[PDB]
Amino acid sequence: MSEIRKDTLKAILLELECHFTWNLLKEDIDLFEVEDTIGQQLEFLTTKSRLALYNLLAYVKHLKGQNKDALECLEQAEEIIQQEHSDKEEVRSLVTWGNYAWVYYHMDQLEEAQKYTGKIGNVCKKLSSPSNYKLECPETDCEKGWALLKFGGKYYQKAKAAFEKALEVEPDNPEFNIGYAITVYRLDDSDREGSVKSFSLGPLRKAVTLNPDNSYIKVFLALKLQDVHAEAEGEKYIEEILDQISSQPYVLRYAAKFYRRKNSWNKALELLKKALEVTPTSSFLHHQMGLCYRAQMIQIKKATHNRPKGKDKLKVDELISSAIFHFKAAMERDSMFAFAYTDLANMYAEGGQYSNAEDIFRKALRLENITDDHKHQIHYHYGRFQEFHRKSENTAIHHYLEALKVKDRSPLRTKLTSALKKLSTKRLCHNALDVQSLSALGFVYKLEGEKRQAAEYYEKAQKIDPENAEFLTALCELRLSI
Ligand code: NA
């Protein structure tokens, strides 16, 4: 090209609406997992927009440094536009064209990139857009919503807003309602301060009514009914779904979750195995298998008062071995799957494989780009491992504190404060000058709103370690609290 035809192009590129401008960061996902599962959905979730899936795959290919392959994906997108969006060819091409411009930009084919921005600017003008190189569009809001969801729990609020934007235009659009309801469904399980949420129940009912032939949306409704103690109603939906479809991994896997949660583990395993025939590498399926084996194992341990003998013991050890295999497989398929790490590590611990559990816990504690909620739970589980398996009370205290610092309102809050109190009190009976324990009690009382008692503990800790910066800050906060 030339400089400043370039410098102008870069400005335009930033004005586009497409994946490159939606702040989808590669560090937040396992690129191989995301790439692989997009392909699986193209094959096995046939109700999801192929156009959106190929646009997204193209972006992911670019993120792997495979710009040449990104182009082939966008060509597939263009074919789908003719196949399924012929009547709206131009407006449906904007995201694809945007991705094209950015990919050609990254390949240093600036002239080619400018061709695409030109086509975009053209269509926007034709359609009376208030912006030069983008166009407000419910369809695009929906695509963005799904792209956001795919980048993980950090994006769920942004995804909800994106679907809301689409529903503002078409409140009764079948596709828009599915996206919204699923987003709200996931948020019901995200960042819980407490008990089960069911804000998705209404949206799910609507989405289901608007999509009467869609077994994928229906399975979430069944799960939500289970959550709200309408298990019998939800189970009838499951039965009806399983009559209408077969072998669909994105439906079976959720039916299997439903059955597991009412302790029908053999049925769950049956469904999961059927799904695995179709998609053997799915981290979701492997995690679910692990959960099933874990539950069966726990039932036996409980029945035999944690002292299984003979064949019960042989069975427990097989289940531990099988749970490990599947948790490990899930973790190896998806490096960002926090619960796969913690579930694997906990099972290693259960089996007395402490070196293996420590290795996994270490990796889990170094995951930077997961949600604070997940970091919170990792600290909690490492803490318990330290407390009950390593018998290392000060390491446990450290991680219980880290858990509360990352997230201080969650369903683990009282387990965390009560364990800290117990441990710190015990240690202070042995050594009244134990600074960590004094500091821990200061932290917990501060958290509980007992300002005066907290200040007393921090003052005792500061008396011993006068230059401590954490203790000075805590005391200032306590003095200045309104
Ligand atoms: Na996934």
- Please report, for residues 166, 238, 253, 282, 374, the alpha-carbon distance to residue 47 in angstroms, rounded to integers and kept in the order given: 19, 19, 17, 19, 31
Q: Which fold has domain 134-198?
A: 1.25.40
Q: How far is the CA of 32 from the centre of ligand 1 (A)?
A: 10
What is the number of alpha carbons within 13 Å of residue 279 lying toward its C-beta?
28
Q: Are 80 and 68 in contact (CB under 8 A)?
A: no
Identify the residue whose tokens are 């134990």.
Answer: 434
Q: How close is the Cα of 446 to the center of ligand 1, in Å?
A: 39
Nearest to 76 by CA among 60, 58, 64, 62: 58
Q: Are the CB atoms for 44 and 278 separated by under 8 Å?
A: yes
Are 55 and 96 contacting, i.e. CB atoms less than 8 angstroms apart? yes
How far does residue 31's CA lie from ligand 1's centre (Å)? 10
Report residue 429 CA to chain centroid gap.
Answer: 42
Supply the angle between the helices 174-189 and 156-169 in degrees, to the nearest 10: 150
**C-alpha of residue 29 to centroid of ligand 1, in Å:** 9
Q: What are the sequence ranges of the domains in the chain?
A: 1-133, 134-198, 199-482
Do 135 and 123 form a contact (C-beta atoms < 8 A)?
yes
Hey, do 1-133 and 134-198 end up sharing a CATH topology, with the first three levels equal? yes
Topology of the domain comprising 1-133? 1.25.40
Contact status, residue 252 vs residue 274, Cβ threshold 8 Å:
yes
How far is the centre of ligand 1, averaged over its atoms, from the C-alpha of 418 (Å)?
A: 35
How many other CB atoms are found less than 10 A from the CB of residue 283? 23
CA distance 132 to 121: 6
Q: How far is the CA of 279 from the centre of ligand 1 (A)?
A: 12
> Could you give the CA distance from residue 402 to residue 446 in angstroms, rounded to a whole number?
15
Tell me how crowded residue 161 is: count the other CB atoms within 10 A of its CB: 14
Q: Which three-class secondary structure string do you get for the chain? A: CCCCCHHHHHHHHHHCCCHHHCCCCHHHCCHHHHHHHHHHHHHHCCCCCHHHHHHHHHHHHHHCCCHHHHHHHHHHHHHHHHHHCHHHCCHHHHHHHHHHHHHHHHCCCHHHHHHHHHHHHHHHHHCCCCCCCCCCCHHHHHHHHHHHHHCCHHHHHHHHHHHHHHHHHCCCCHHHHHHHHHHHHHHHHCCCCCCCCCCCHHHHHHHHHHCCCCHHHHHHHHHHHHHCCCHHHHHHHHHHHHHHCCCCHHHHHHHHHHHHHCCCHHHHHHHHHHHHHHCCCCHHHHHHHHHHHHHHHHHHHHHCCCCCCHHHHHHHHHHHHHHHHHHHHHHHHCCCCHHHHHHHHHHHHHCCCHHHHHHHHHHHHCCCCCCHHHHHHHHHHHHHHHHHHHCCHHHHHHHHHHHHHHCCCCCCHHHHHHHHHHHHHHHHHHCCCCHHHHHHHHHHHHHCCCHHHHHHHHHHHHHHCCCCHHHHHHHHHHHHCC
CA gap 435, 441 in Å, rounded: 10
CA 74 / ligand 1 centre spacing (Å): 22
Determined by X-ray
Contact at 8 Å (CB) between 455 and 480?
no
Q: What is the CA(239)–ligand 1 centre distance, in A?
A: 25
Token code pair at residue 319: 């289940």
Is 31 in contact with 150 (CB distance < 8 Å)?
no
Q: Distance between CA atoms of 94 and 132, rounded to whole angstroms?
A: 12
Q: Give how far Cα 160 sits from Cα of 141, 157, 165, 444, Å.
A: 10, 5, 9, 34
Closest residue by Cα to residue 384 from 440, 340, 342, 325: 342
Q: Which two tokens stand for residue 201?
A: 């129940």
CA of residue 40 to ligand 1 center, whole Å = 11
